UniProtKB/Swiss-Prot annotation, chains A, B:
Binding locations of substrate: R88, R98, R122, D212
Organism: Mycobacterium tuberculosis (strain ATCC 25618 / H37Rv)
GO cellular component: cytoplasm
Cofactor: Mg(2+); Mn(2+)
EC number: 1.1.1.85
Official protein name in the record: 3-isopropylmalate dehydrogenase
Family indicated by similarity: Belongs to the isocitrate and isopropylmalate dehydrogenases family. LeuB type 2 subfamily.
Cofactor note: Binds 1 Mg(2+) or Mn(2+) ion per subunit.
Key word ATP-binding present: no
EC class of the enzyme, as a word: oxidoreductase
An example Gene Ontology biological process: L-leucine biosynthetic process
Gene responsible for this protein: leuB
């Protein structure tokens, strides 16, 4: 590891992040941690969302651990577009890594406890999630609104390369998910890029599914997936579907990765700030701790990451339906390290 | 009176349509039926996909019943674009109606057989699945590919108006599903339109969900939906998810509706032509028959539609696990009318 920027953020972010940090401290001692109040606290204190110079400080660290951002006290989208999206674009988090594993101790909403262990690699910096478009004649029967998705060989190849790498390290199956029959230009780019990068991974079996079909298979046959690669919009949907079939976004972790390592990558539990339960010591820190494993793995701390993975699995396997405070979960996971 | 165009189409289409037509005639005797030979068959014999002359003939009908279209022997996208999409566009099928009900007797891939009874109303004739965009520098690291989604007040309000009418006739709950935080222009148009049309429906409770959150809810809490309204792209994903949790696409029907009634609306089973089981009398005609119920209800034949619904439900509740031939299901349903 070495230098960690911590953005515990809002709501339940601080309490879960505290546990995640405790776990990180217990598996890799001697980490320099810099804590940032970014999100609602900083926004109320200073009016600042993601000050240019904050991005600059964040670059000084090996990685970022984020809790959650969002509070009903801050005006709509201010933090989401100005903090979270911006960080992702500024730090070139082109890889959104979203593992979906159904652990012993976690109920799936699917019938009959299938083994599920896949990872979604979602393109994170292009497509229509970027804000490109416009409207005319707004608020009239004549309104026309356009949304433009920009896709690039540059963006796509990076994410595809990363997904193949991950497939190679896993069960050597990659599923491209897109909608090539109807998004013919973006889909054509995705397909060809998968094929082309595929030439370097003859050991990786490649499948293609339309996103609607993939959605079905996530529900009926989620064990068919090893690594899924997809674009920003479809990945947004299917990573949430993945989390749901694996017991929910409350047990999902996310990596926002600059594979070039030029910028620090960021890791966070998928869940939001849940302001309604903020600071009650109710929130489950499991996902935030799981995001620490992701962070460790990204940084090459494979044994440390393995330790956290094991400790998480241990906690999920015996928690049963016990009401456990946030610090109790952290204690349980820490004890299994 | 009632004039019906029948596009039995390819593969299993003929067989299931025969049963659908058997059920039609049993409930509404006076139906002028014209058969149309469109799909792989026509394409091979004549080279024609959807001549303008044929569309004109189809316009002379009160509704269109379609089996299934497409075959491995036809080049990719040629029937989907030149027949199916073209029919959708030319006949102004701006509403795609996709009921999702889990029937007694049908296994859901979800745990604990949850109550599921919703309808998705999906915008049909705009958005990105129209073909809009392009690419430059293809096949190089400089490739840039764009996809453009055009959304209009004209198109959106039609779909939204229809959704509200459906929610009023149902459980008076409408969920708009979009992604307004990042598709800001199309999103704002959908939000504002639902709000504005909603003014005429104070009886309808309106909820909004991002598509990612809605897909989580389709699997964890599908009972929360009554009517869903969404755009073409998102509807394409969620209708497939909906079919899956309701026991599969093999049991889903679809309405492609011009709600102004200027053109005939079209009704079909959601399933494809399944050429591998064609003419074998294996194909389950249930969905084709459910599509007839939608057709009839669209045409104002509410009693006849109710009779079909009851007969289909009776069939699904008592079929059990025994392998039924096509005409068997057909007769099982027809007898229960």
């Amino acid at each position: 590891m070495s230098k960690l920027a911590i953005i515990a953020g809002d709501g339940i972010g601080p309490e879960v992040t505290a546990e995640a940090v405790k776990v990180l401290d217990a598996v890799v001692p001697g980490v320099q941690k810099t804590s940032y109040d970014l999100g609602a606290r900083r926004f109320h204190a200073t009016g600042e969302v993601l000050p240019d110079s904050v991005v600059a400080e964040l670059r000084n660290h090996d990685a970022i651990l984020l809790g959650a951002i969002g509070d009903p006290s801050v005006p709509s989208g201010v933090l989401e577009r100005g903090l979270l999206l911006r960080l992702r674009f500024e730090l070139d988090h082109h890889i959104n890594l979203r593992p979906a594993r159904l652990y012993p101790g976690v109920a799936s909403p699917l019938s009959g406890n299938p083994g599920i262990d896949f990872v979604v690699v979602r393109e994170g910096t292009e497509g229509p999630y970027t804000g490109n478009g416009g409207a005319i004649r707004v608020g009239t029967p004549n309104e026309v609104a356009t949304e433009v998705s920009v896709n690039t060989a540059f963006g796509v190849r990076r994410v595809v390369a990363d997904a193949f790498e991950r497939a190679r390290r896993r069960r050597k199956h990659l599923t491209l998910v897109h909608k090539t029959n109807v998004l013919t230009f973006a889909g054509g780019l995705w397909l060809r890029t998968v094929d082309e990068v595929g030439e370097c991974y003859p050991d990786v079996e490649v499948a293609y599914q339309h996103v609607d079909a993939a959605t079905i298979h996530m529900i009926t046959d989620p064990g068919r997936f090893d690594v899924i690669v997809t674009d920003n919009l479809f990945g947004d949907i299917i990573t949430d579907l993945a989390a749901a079939v694996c017991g929910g976004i409350g047990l999902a972790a996310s990596g926002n990765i600059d594979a070039t390592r030029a910028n620090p990558s960021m890791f966070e539990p998928v869940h939001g700030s849940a302001p309604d339960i903020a600071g009650q010591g109710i929130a489950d820190p499991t996902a935030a701790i799981m995001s620490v494993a992701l962070l460790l793995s990204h940084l090459g701390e494979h044994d440390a990451a393995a330790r956290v993975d094991r400790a998480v699995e241990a906690h999920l396997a015996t928690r049963g339906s016990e009401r456990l405070a946030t610090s109790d979960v952290g204690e349980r996971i820490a004890a299994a390290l």
